[PDB]
Design an enzyme around this catalytic site. Structure first.
Site, PDB file in Angstrom:
ATOM      1  N   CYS A 135       0.923  -1.115   0.199  1.00  0.00           N
ATOM      2  CA  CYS A 135       0.131  -0.049  -0.111  1.00  0.00           C
ATOM      3  C   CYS A 135       0.761   1.200   0.105  1.00  0.00           C
ATOM      4  CB  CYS A 135      -0.773  -0.019   1.116  1.00  0.00           C
ATOM      5  SG  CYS A 135      -1.776   1.322   1.529  1.00  0.00           S
ATOM      6  N   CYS A 192      -0.122   4.307   2.222  1.00  0.00           N
ATOM      7  CA  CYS A 192       0.110   3.845   3.779  1.00  0.00           C
ATOM      8  C   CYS A 192       1.357   4.472   4.166  1.00  0.00           C
ATOM      9  CB  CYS A 192       0.086   2.379   3.900  1.00  0.00           C
ATOM     10  SG  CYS A 192      -1.612   1.716   3.658  1.00  0.00           S
TER      11      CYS A 192
END
Length: 108
Positions: A32, A35
């Protein structure tokens, strides 16, 4: 609670459900990208509310049970909880300001 603790499904009940304070749960994954922007910010929130909030984080891949429990269908994701009560939730990267207000609204 000066910082963030990384937990797993096996520790969820004792570290979160049975905690004495509200807990900010952050979900992330190694695949991700966005993230990466949130991780530093979550750490900041932990230091900032060290005396009134516990902050934990879980990687989604190895933790199917907690992910299912909170209907985490995308990362990054946040769930603010108190025992079995979900106080609030958010999806996606948010600004430091939005995060601080997200917390202030519930901690007060």
């Amino acid at each position: 609670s000066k910082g963030v603790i990384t937990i797993t499904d096996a520790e969820f009940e004792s570290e979160v459900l049975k905690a004495e304070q509200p807990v900010l749960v952050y979900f992330w994954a190694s695949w991700c990208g966005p993230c990466q922007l949130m991780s530093p910010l979550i750490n900041l929130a932990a230091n900032t509310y060290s005396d009134r909030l516990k902050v934990v984080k879980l990687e989604i891949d190895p933790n199917p049970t907690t992910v299912k429990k909170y209907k985490v269908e995308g990362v990054p994701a946040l769930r603010l909880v108190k025992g079995e009560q979900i106080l609030d939730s958010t999806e996606g990267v948010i600004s430091k300001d939005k995060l601080l207000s997200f917390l202030d609204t519930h901690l007060n």
